[PDB]
Each structure stands twice: as C-alpha cells, then as structure tokens.
Design a protein around this nucleic acid. Structure first.
Lengths: 97, 115, 99, 74, 50, 75, 302
DNA sequence: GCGGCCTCGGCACCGGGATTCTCGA
DNA sequence: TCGAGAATCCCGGTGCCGAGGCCGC
C-alpha cells in the first residue's frame, strides 16, 4: 500500500534516472550495463541512500540543529580521500550556484 | 604462483619435514644460494611455508617445476606410497641403442598426452 | 606500551596464537587508526561547533563505524567490553546523583 | 542528465523518519551529485575490477564483489 | 497487484545465475570435449590406420 | 587482559594532534573505540585465517584485514 | 546373599572347575521388540573398542537428561582444560527380560556427527545380575569407537558420578579363537566378508603378522569337517577347527601358526581384535556376539 | 641440557573406482 | 543374447592421538 506505493515509485524513479545515468556513464568506457546490472546498481543506490539519510539526519542532530546544511554533507564526503578531493571542487561549484 | 600450483607447492612443502628443508629446496633449483638466506628455515612451519611460496610468487612457479618439487620430496620419502614393479620385455633383437633422455622424455610425454 | 596492551589484548580477543611480525604491523594499524580517529574526532567536534570532544561527539563517530545502532546504543556498547570502574565514569548510574 | 528536484525531494524524504526535516535545494543538488557519483563510482569500480578480469560486460557477480568495498567506502 | 497474485499463483503452487554461468562454462567444456574427441578419435584413426 | 591505560591514550591523543580538548573521560571512549576496532580486527582476521585455512594468524592475513576494517572504522 | 553370593561366585570362578564352555552356536537373534532399526543398523558396522564396566551405583533409566547435561558440561570443560551428549536407551539390547536395558552415550557435534557413540550393554549377563544388589544397574560391557581421548574423559566422568570403572577389555587369543569358531558355525547366508585370522608371531626383534584369510564358505565347509555334535560347539571342536587351520598353514609355509597368537579374527558375523578395538558387528547377530562379549566382561569384573 | 611446550607419523576408520552382474538398445 | 546402473570386494587416501624434539628454571 502506502509503503509499497512510496518505495516502489521511488524505486522506479531511481531506476529511470539511474538508467539515464547508465547511458551517460556507459559512453565513457564503451561499456553496456545489463538489465540485472542496472537493477542491482539502482537498488544499491536505494539501499545506501537509506544509509545517507541515516547519516545526514544525525549529522544535523550532532550540531544541535534541525536543518541539513553543506557541512553535514561535507561530513558525508569526509569518508574517503578520493571523493574528498572530488567533492571539494564540486562543492565550490555548488557555491557558484 | 597459480591455481593448483601455488597451493600445491604449499601442500608439498608442509609435507616435507623441518630437518630436510634445505636438502630438498636446494636440489629443485628455484631457490638459489641468495634466496636461502632470506627465509629463516629454522623458525616455524607456517612461517617457512608462507615465505618460501612467496619466494616462488616472485619466481613465478609453474607446475612443471612444482611437480619436480614433489619428485624430490618423494626421492627421500620413497618408503611411502607402495610401489608396483613393471617389467618390460623386448623380443628378439639388439637392445635400445637410443635411450636418449630427451628422446625418452619426448616419446613418453607424446604418447601420454596422445590419450 | 598501550599498543603492546592492545596486541596482548588481541591475543585474548583473537583467541588464537599469532606472530610478533603480525603485531608490529597491527601497531601501524593502530597508529593509522588514530591517524584517522583523532582527526575524525577533530572534524566531528568541529561539525558540532565545539572545541572540546564531548561524549556525544564520539557517539556519532561510532554510529559512523556502524557499532552504534538503534538496537545497540552507545551505553550498551560500554556494558559489553569496558570494566565496571570504567563504565562508572561513562554511562550515568543513579544515586539521585547520576554520573 | 541528472536526478531531478521533485524526485530528490521525494526519494530522500521517504527514508526520513520524521516529517519536519527538509533538505534545501542548495544541499539537494549536491545530494544529486553525491548519488550521481554513487552511480559513477560504483560503475567505475565495477568496470575497473572488470578490466582487472578483462571483461566487456558487467555481470552479476562483479557488483557483488564490489559491495564489500563499495558500501565500506561509499 | 496482479503480479503479486501471480507470485501467489505460481510460487504457492510450484539455480539460475549458476545455471547461466555454469551452462556457458560447461558449453565451453563441451567445445573442449569436442576438440578432445576430434584429437583422440582422429589420432585413434591414425593409430589404427597404422 | 583486564586493563585500559588512562595515560597512554591521552599521551597518544596529544602527540598525534596537539589541538583538542578531549573531555574528562573522552579518552575512555577512545579506548572503547580501539577495543571494538581490535575486536573487529580479531574476528575478521579469524575469518581471514579460515579463508586460507591457516591455523596461525600471519602477516598476509593481517594486511588483508587492515584494508577492510581500518577503512571501515574510518568516520 | 548381597555380597557373600559374589564371594562364592569368585570362589567358583577362581576354582577353575572344568571350564570348556560347550557353547550354543549363536542363534539367529530376531531383533527383539523396538531395537531402533536406524540406531541398531548404525551401531552394527562400527568398530567398538570394548571395555569392562563395573556396575553403576545409583543409576536410573529416567534421569537421562540430567546425566546428559552433567556430562556435556563436563566434556566441554575438559576442552577448557559445540558438543552434545545424548544418552539414549536402546530398548532391546538385552538377553533376558531382567537384564538392564542398554543405553548409548553419543558425543554429537552443529550436525549429527557422532564423534564418540559410547555403548553400555548387558545381554545374557545374568551371572552378574543375580549377585549385585538393586541399586546398581550393572552393564559389564562398554563400547567406545570415539577417540581414545574422549573415552578416557567419559570414563572419568562415569567414575566420578557412578563409581563404575573401565578396565579395557582384552580378549585373549583363547577367547578369540572360540569366537572365531562359533561365528563360522553360524547358519548365515550371503557372507559379507572373508574369515580372516590376523596372527602375530612372538619374535623379539621383528613383529611379523599373518592374515590367514579364508574364503567364508570354505571355512564353513572346513568347520563341518570338525563339527560332530550339533547345537553346541565344544572346546575340542574349536581346537580341531583351529588345528585344521594350523595344519593347513604349517603345511604350506612350514611355520607353526599354533606357536603364534591371534590378534584379530574377522568373520562374516563379527570382527574381533585382541587389544580392545575389537567388535565390528557386520551381521545382526549382535545379541549373541554381545552375549559372548558380556560373558567375557563378567570374567574380567568377577 | 631440562620444563611445558610443540610437531610427524603408525594405525585405523570412512569415502570413491573398477569388477560383478544384473537388465535395456 | 548385451549396455548402462548400482554395490560392493580390494586397498587407499584420509583423520588423529602417542612419540620425539625443544626452549626457561
């Protein structure tokens, strides 16, 4: 019902936009993402978006705050060096907007 | 340094006892004199069976010589794996004027890999 | 010292004999563990906006390490491993004077 | 293209355990970026272990062997 | 809904990745076996030709 | 072993990073973090030992353990 | 009567009054009552290492769960110095109705990998029942098969809780030849294994062993040559069977087998060693083979 | 060169290969 | 009559507990 219509509709949206991303990243390394491969990577995006939501809420709770700001996702970007460097420049590009 | 080769070497190196580690590892020629000092043969069994096989990981050990390791292991442990005796018999004529070890190695491997 | 304390505790935590050559590398593992931690406490305490590192500053970090959950909170984790006179400092008991 | 605004509002707000927490568009488009690079990173790690096995296809098992470091890393 | 009762109609009434992968592997194995029969049988034809 | 060094963890937290204000018993939390990190190390290294069926933990199992758990224990 | 009867029994046994036990050929023992077919069939082709077990003080076939826990908590504690212990009454391993019901002791490790499978049985052992009081449930036979380490742990537990003592039952070559003769005298069909007699000569420097393995039907026809009185085999008939083996071996190899000692007598009925690792129970004669084995255990106890 | 430590190895019990011998092409 | 399937005789290839070696007091 509502839980199913919620998460299946966003599973559909994740698959649709992630398939657009699959066509957008399949042209770099001349690769093809098979139907089960897209189906998997979409559900890992879903399952670890659960992880990002779990992290980000308590990240705001950690600063005695209710809203989620850029330092919270920076702590989400704190995890790994390569995407620290990637997200630093993408974050200054965020600030350009 | 391969499947059924590196772990095969591991399984034939824990087979050989600690006393004759030098004796069998010197004869199979992959570990030259310089390689013997790197591994401390007197320390432990799992230590040597892990450092020696690494010394073949750098030496890219192949089954052709991994099997030679097993041969040299059995040359000092021939008192296991009970042995049958086969007796050949030539008919009337001169003996085998050509048992070339190269030719015999060829005439054995060719016939065996034929079937 | 303390790294030698943890490698000896590794012996009673791994329940299985290991090698000393394994222990000086787990020493580098603890050194890098702090090389990630003390600047992870750094960045997490800076995230809270506080100069000091309060206990909840580390509860979030251990939530990051997946050891604090909605099932396993911070304090329950203290029950299972720390000795009594040490968890008396951490988890608030009650005397009408909760620590 | 990307993972759009009315969809990033909806997907993140589904896993939100309370109704009163919002994520702003400034952070929303960066969330788009972080899960877009979730796809990019998972895909590049999969195809990287694919050249490591030298494949022209990303199969089922490659993704399963990349999760133990994907979820650990990302 | 009809797909969930399709579940309730098939699974209630009543490997695959191993199927596909192992079947391709075993098909290469049968190609190797056809090569084996080509080699062994032909060398048998030459041996019994001798 | 039934101990937890008060002095050593504080000395490490001061040597490695000179600018913090770790609380009265915050170093006790650091000890708990390292205790659980070495728990994970011991258990996943036991898993590594069973992976190669080695009855003694060695270097080649600890180095594989590090890149999983130490990275996992990063905040 | 409560002890003095046993003293008179000891007197009779030590007297050694004309022993030759003309024994009835082990009769086909149709499996009595329950005798769990799965359990008994699992218990047949297992090499039981015999022991002699003194009667158990204060034992009851109701408190099996309590002893199971008390021994399980003791075995895993001997590992401190994964395992389940299932005491299981066998309900049918008894010769007469008054014998104590045989019960098992299995070291079950996850799945049913029975590591040890102990076995105490008292069949046709009414030379011990009528001499011991009611408090003791006497099971002269103990059957190991698990490692000797686990046997030397459950035996210690049994000594500690029941005051029963395990002497390792060693079948002397005389009793071994007896059982080797009454098992080729049986009326079986489809002989499972050849009748092998593993001799072992008493040379001081060397330890040559002989496996005088006869075709099982050929040994039955050789037994019929020396079998004259039916129903019961005598000591002279057993000795003549063994001497026909001797005069077929010294005839061939000029070495007097009678100058050697039996160490193992494999037969289609039941293999039987000397040093203890004795009773394999190939066929379902085990109530008769066990009858002989219990009668031999009385000899060691009494 | 011994004290509680450990590691090979004879003996032995349990798991597949080819011979029996029964059934299908 | 003969060809594949199952069981089981013959001996492994394995499991696992004493013996020998070896490093503090």
């Amino acid at each position: 019902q509502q839980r199913f219509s919620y998460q299946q509709r966003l599973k559909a949206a994740v698959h649709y936009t992630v398939g657009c991303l699959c066509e957008e990243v399949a042209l770099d390394k001349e690769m093809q993402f098979s139907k089960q491969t897209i189906a998997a990577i979409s559900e890992l995006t879903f399952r670890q978006c659960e992880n990002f939501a779990k992290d980000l809420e308590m990240f705001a709770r950690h600063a005695k705050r209710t809203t989620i700001n850029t330092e919270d996702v920076k702590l989400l970007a704190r995890r790994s060096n390569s995407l620290l460097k990637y997200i630093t420049d993408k974050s200054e590009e965020i600030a350009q907007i | 340094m391969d499947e059924t080769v590196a772990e095969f070497i591991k399984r034939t190196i824990l087979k050989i006892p600690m006393n004759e580690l030098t004796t069998i590892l010197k004869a199979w020629d992959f570990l030259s004199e310089n390689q013997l000092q790197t591994v401390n043969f007197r320390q432990r069994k799992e230590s040597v069976v892990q450092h020696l096989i690494h010394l073949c990981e750098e030496k890219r050990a192949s089954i052709s010589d991994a099997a030679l390791l097993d041969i040299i292991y059995m040359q000092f442990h021939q008192h296991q794996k009970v042995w049958e005796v086969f007796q050949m018999s030539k008919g009337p004529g001169e003996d085998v004027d050509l048992f070339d070890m190269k030719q015999f190695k060829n005439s054995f491997k060719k016939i065996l890999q034929r079937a | 010292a303390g790294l030698s304390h943890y490698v000896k505790l590794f012996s009673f935590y791994a329940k299985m004999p290991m090698e000393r050559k394994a222990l000086e590398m787990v020493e580098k593992c603890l050194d890098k563990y702090f090389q990630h931690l003390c600047d992870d406490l750094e960045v997490f305490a800076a995230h809270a906006g506080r100069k000091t590192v309060k206990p909840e500053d580390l509860e979030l970090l251990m939530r990051r390490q997946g050891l604090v959950t909605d099932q396993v909170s911070l304090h329950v984790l203290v029950e299972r491993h720390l000795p009594l006179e040490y968890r008396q400092l951490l988890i608030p008991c009650a005397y009408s004077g909760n620590s | 293209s990307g993972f759009r605004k009315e969809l990033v509002s909806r997907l993140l707000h589904l896993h939100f355990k309370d109704d009163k927490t919002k994520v702003s568009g400034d952070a929303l488009q960066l969330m788009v970026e972080l899960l877009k690079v979730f796809v990019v990173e998972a895909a590049v790690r999969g195809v990287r272990q694919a050249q490591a096995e030298d494949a022209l296809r990303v199969d089922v098992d490659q993704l399963e062997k990349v999760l133990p470091q994907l979820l650990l890393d990302f | 809904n009809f797909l969930k009762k399709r579940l309730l109609q098939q699974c209630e009434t009543l490997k695959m990745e191993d199927l596909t992968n192992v079947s391709s592997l075993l098909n290469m194995e049968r190609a190797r076996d056809k090569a084996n029969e080509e080699g062994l049988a032909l060398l048998q034809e030459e041996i019994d030709k001798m | 072993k039934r101990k937890a060094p008060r002095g050593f963890l504080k000395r490490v937290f001061k040597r490695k990073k000179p600018q913090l204000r770790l609380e009265k018993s915050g170093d006790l939390l650091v000890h708990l973090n390292c205790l659980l990190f070495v728990h994970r190390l011991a258990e996943e290294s036991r898993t590594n030992a069973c992976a190669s069926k080695c009855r003694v933990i060695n270097k080649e199992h600890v180095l594989a353990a590090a890149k999983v758990i130490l990275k996992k224990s990063r905040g | 009567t409560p002890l003095q009867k046993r003293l008179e029994s000891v007197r009779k046994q030590s007297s050694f009054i004309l022993t030759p036990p003309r024994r009835k050929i082990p009769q086909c023992s149709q499996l009595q009552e329950d005798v769990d077919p799965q359990k008994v069939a699992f218990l047949l082709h297992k090499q039981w290492t015999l022991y002699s077990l003194t009667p158990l003080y204060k034992f009851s076939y109701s408190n099996l769960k309590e002893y199971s826990r008390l021994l399980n908590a003791f075995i895993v504690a001997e590992k401190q110095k994964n395992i389940k212990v299932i005491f299981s009454t066998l309900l049918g391993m008894k010769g007469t109705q008054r014998d104590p019901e045989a019960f098992l002791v299995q070291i079950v490790s996850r799945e049913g990998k029975v590591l040890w499978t102990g076995w105490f049985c008292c069949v046709f052992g009414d030379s011990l029942l009528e001499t011991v009081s009611e408090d003791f449930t006497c099971l002269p036979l103990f059957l190991a098969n698990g490692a000797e380490s686990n046997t030397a742990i459950i035996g210690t537990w049994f000594q500690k809780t029941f005051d029963c003592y395990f002497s390792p039952l060693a079948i002397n070559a005389f009793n071994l030849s007896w059982m080797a003769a009454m098992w080729t005298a049986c009326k079986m069909d489809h002989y499972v294994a050849t009748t092998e007699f593993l001799w072992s000569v008493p040379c001081s420097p060397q330890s040559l062993d002989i496996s005088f393995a006869i075709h099982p039907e050929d040994a039955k026809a050789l037994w019929d040559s020396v079998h004259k009185t039916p129903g019961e085999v005598t000591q002279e008939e057993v000795d003549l069977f063994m001497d026909c083996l001797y005069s077929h071996f010294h005839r061939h190899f000029k070495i007097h087998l009678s100058a050697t000692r039996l160490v193992r007598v494999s037969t289609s009925v039941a293999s039987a060693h000397t040093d203890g690792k004795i009773k394999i129970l190939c066929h379902k004669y085990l109530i008769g083979v066990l009858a002989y084995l219990t009668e031999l255990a009385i000899f060691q106890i009494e």
